Amino acid sequence: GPLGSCDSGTGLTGNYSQDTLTVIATLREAIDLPQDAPNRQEVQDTARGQINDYISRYRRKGDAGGLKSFTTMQTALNSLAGYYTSYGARPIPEKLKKRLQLEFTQAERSIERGV
Numbered sequence: 001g002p003l004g005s006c007d008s009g010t011g012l013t014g015n016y017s018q019d020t021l022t023v024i025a026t027l028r029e030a031i032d033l034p035q036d037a038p039n040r041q042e043v044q045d046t047a048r049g050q051i052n053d054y055i056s057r058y059r060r061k062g063d064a065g066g067l068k069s070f071t072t073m074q075t076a077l078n079s080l081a082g083y084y085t086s087y088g089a090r091p092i093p094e095k096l097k098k099r100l101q102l103e104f105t106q107a108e109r110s111i112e113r114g115v
Contacts, residue, residue, distance in 0.1 A: 010049035016058055020069055020111050023050040024104040027080065031100060035091030044084045051077040069110035076103040 011026065012019040030047045033039065055074055064071035080100055083092050092100070 010046065010053050012050065012053050012057065014057065016061065016070075017111055017114065019054060019058070020073065021108055023047075023054045023073070023077070024108050026050050027077075028101065028104055031080075031092050031097050040091070041089045044089065048081060048084065051081045067110070067115045069107045069115055072103060072110070073107045076100060076107070 011022045013022070026047055027050070030043050033043060037043070054077060058070060061067070062070060064074050080092065080096070083096065
């Protein structure tokens with residue numbers, strides 16, 4: 001386990017309410033960046049941390065089937081996470097980006113009501 005940065009915590013505070021928004025804020029801007037950005041590999045790793053950390057900590061939250069945000073996010077984050085590893089550092093297609101934007105919109109919207 002040689003891997004381990006000095007910093008701790010991708011950004012989540014453990015609160016499902018803000019945590020959902022935190023990963024969304026990072027993901028929206030992450031995919032927004034230009035495919036010509038040098039932080040293409042770095043930004044992917046950062047977001048990947050939020051993705052894994054988000055479901056990992058909230059894995060036992062409900063395992064989906066109760067919260068629209070968690071259920072929707074589970075698939076959205078998993079789908080997008082696969083894109084980076086599936087192709088690597090390649091940029092996410094514009095089609096997926098547009099669809100993902102809505103996915104996150106629905107997730108943050110659910111937080112307001114607190115499904």
